[PDB]
Amino acid sequence: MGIPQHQQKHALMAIKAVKRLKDARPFLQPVDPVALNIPLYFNFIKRPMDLQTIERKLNANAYETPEQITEDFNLMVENSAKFNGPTAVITQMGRNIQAAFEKHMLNMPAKD
Ligand SMILES: Cc1ccc(-c2nnc(C)c(NCc3ccc(C)o3)n2)cc1
Ligand SMILES: [K+]
């Protein structure tokens, strides 16, 4: 069920290093469109994604490929691109943490 334990451990190391980057702050938790008075968020963003959801899918063995993790990350960034604009501060921070995460994933050991 899910990626093998060594792949999962590498991915969790990656996530935990990323969470500690200041650029991660806006993605630590799910966006709360009501707390933030942005009602149009769930109309534009059909699939919200955040670092907490990713981590908890990881622990649940809900990821079958490292590419799924990367895709959820990408989606996390494309959401802010779509709702705040391509050059908003939050979007650039998303891009920065996405770069850091891919960099970490480069060293992802193989299934075998
Ligand atoms: C008026 C406005 C419009 C969009 C957004 C917004 N868009 N995307 C995301 C991922 C996001 N995350 C919440 C967050 C940002 C900073 C911290 C500490 O939490 N907020 C915030 C305010
Ligand atoms: K904006």
Author numbering: 126 to 237
Please give sentences taken from the publication describing this entry.
The fungal Bromodomain and Extra‐Terminal (BET) protein Bdf1 is a potential antifungal target against invasive fungal infections. One attractive target is the fungal BET protein Bdf1, a global transcriptional regulator. BET proteins bind chromatin through their two bromodomains (BDs), BD1 and BD2, which specifically recognize histones acetylated on lysines. We show that Bdf1 is essential in C. glabrata, and that inactivation of both Bdf1 BDs induces lethality.
Surprisingly, unlike 24 and the other analogs, methylfuryl‐containing compounds 24c and d significantly inhibited CgBD2 in the HTRF assay and inhibited the growth of C. glabrata strains expressing WT Bdf1 and the Bdf1‐Δbd1 mutant. Of the two compounds, 24c exhibited the more potent BD inhibition (IC50 values of 8 and 12 µm against CgBD1 and CgBD2, respectively) and antifungal activity against the WT strain (EC50 value of 90 µM), while displaying only modest cytotoxicity toward HeLa and IMR90 (primary fibroblast) cells at the highest concentration tested (300 µM) in an MTT colorimetric assay. The crystal structure of CgBD1 bound to 24c revealed that the methyltriazine moiety forms direct and water‐mediated H bonds with BC loop residue Asn209 and ZA loop residue Tyr166, respectively. The p‐methylphenyl moiety is recognized by hydrophobic residues Leu161, Ile163, Phe208 and Ile215, including a close contact between the p‐methyl group of 24c and the Ile163 methyl group. Shifting the compound's methyl group to a meta position would abolish this contact and (in one of the two meta positions) yield a steric clash with Phe208, explaining the loss of potency for compounds with this configuration. The methlyfuryl ring packs against Pro151 in the RPF shelf, while the methyl group makes a van der Waals contact with Arg150. Considerable space surrounds this moiety in the binding pocket, explaining why its replacement by certain bulkier substituents is well tolerated. Superimposing the structures of 24 and 24a onto that of 24c reveals that the thiophenyl, furyl and methylfuryl groups of these compounds would all clash with the Tyr327 gauche‐ conformation but that only the methylfuryl group would form a favorable contact with the trans conformation, explaining why compounds 24c and 24d, but not the other analogs, inhibit CgBD2. Namely, whereas CgBD residues Arg150 and Tyr327 point away from the binding pocket, the corresponding Brd4 Trp81 and Typ374 side chains point into the pocket and would clash with the compound's methylfuryl group. In summary, the identification of 24c demonstrates the feasibility of developing inhibitors that target both CgBDs with selectivity over the human BET BDs.
